Design a protein around this ligand. Structure first.
Ligand code: Q5E
Length: 178
C-alpha cells in the first residue's frame, strides 16, 4: 500500500558537526552505508555511487568528484559545493558536468576526519524533496558501533530498515590514480 517518498524531516532534526575543519575533510572517502527516502525497488541510481573526492579550492569551495560502479563500466560526475550559512553546510555552485537542475542542500552531521563521516543531502526533483544519508570511511570498513549509530540516525528521520544498505566493498572504479 506503499508511498513513493518518506516525507523530508524538519532541518531542526539534522545537526551539524561542531567546529567543522574544511582542510581536514579534504580528500577521498569510501561509501560504507547509504539510506534514502525512495523505495530501493525503484530508486536505483544513487546506490551506484561508491566513492567521493572533496577537493578544497583557494576560494573555500570544494570541487567534488562522484564515482559510480556499473557491472561493465565506471561513470563519473563533477559539481561544486559553495559554503552555506554555517561551517559544515553547503549549496550547489553553477560549475558542473551535467545540465540537470540547480538545487542541493548539504549538511555534515558527524566526522572525526581520519575514520568516519556522516553527510545529509536534500534535493528538489519534479517539485518534491528527495533526501539521502551517506556513512563514509577513510578505509573500506567501519566498526559495528559506528554502523549501528548511522542506522539509529536514519530511523530518527523516518527511514525503515529496508531503506538502509551497506554495499560489499569493491576494487573497480574507486581505486586507480584519482
Ligand atoms: O545527472 C544528473 O542530473 C544527476 C547526477 C548526479 C550528480 C552527482 N551526485 C550528487 O550530487 C550527489 C551524488 C551524486 O552522484 C548522489 Cl548519489 C546523487 Cl545521484 C545525487 Cl543528486 C547526490 Cl545529492 C547524491 Cl549523494 Cl544522492
Amino acid at each position: 500500500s506503499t508511498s513513493d517518498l518518506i516525507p523530508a524531516p524538519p532541518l531542526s532534526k539534522v545537526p551539524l558537526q561542531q567546529n567543522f575543519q574544511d582542510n581536514q575533510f579534504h580528500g577521498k572517502w569510501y561509501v560504507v552505508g547509504m539510506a534514502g527516502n525512495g523505495d530501493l525497488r525503484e530508486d536505483k541510481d544513487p546506490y551506484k555511487m561508491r566513492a567521493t573526492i572533496y577537493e578544497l579550492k583557494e576560494d573555500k569551495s570544494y570541487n567534488v568528484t562522484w564515482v559510480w560502479f556499473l557491472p561493465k563500466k565506471c561513470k563519473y560526475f563533477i559539481n561544486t559545493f559553495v559554503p552555506g550559512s554555517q561551517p559544515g553546510e553547503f549549496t550547489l555552485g553553477l560549475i558542473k558536468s551535467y545540465p540537470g537542475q540547480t538545487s542541493l542542500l548539504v549538511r555534515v552531521v558527524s566526522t572525526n576526519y581520519n575514520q568516519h563521516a556522516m553527510v545529509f543531502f536534500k534535493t528538489v526533483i519534479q517539485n518534491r524533496e528527495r533526501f539521502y544519508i551517506t556513512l563514509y570511511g577513510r578505509t573500506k570498513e567501519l566498526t559495528s558501533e559506528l554502523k549501528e549509530n548511522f542506522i539509529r540516525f536514519s530511523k530518527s528521520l523516518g527511514l525503515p530498515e529496508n531503506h538502509i544498505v551497506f554495499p560489499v566493498p569493491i576494487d573497480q572504479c574507486i581505486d586507480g590514480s584519482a
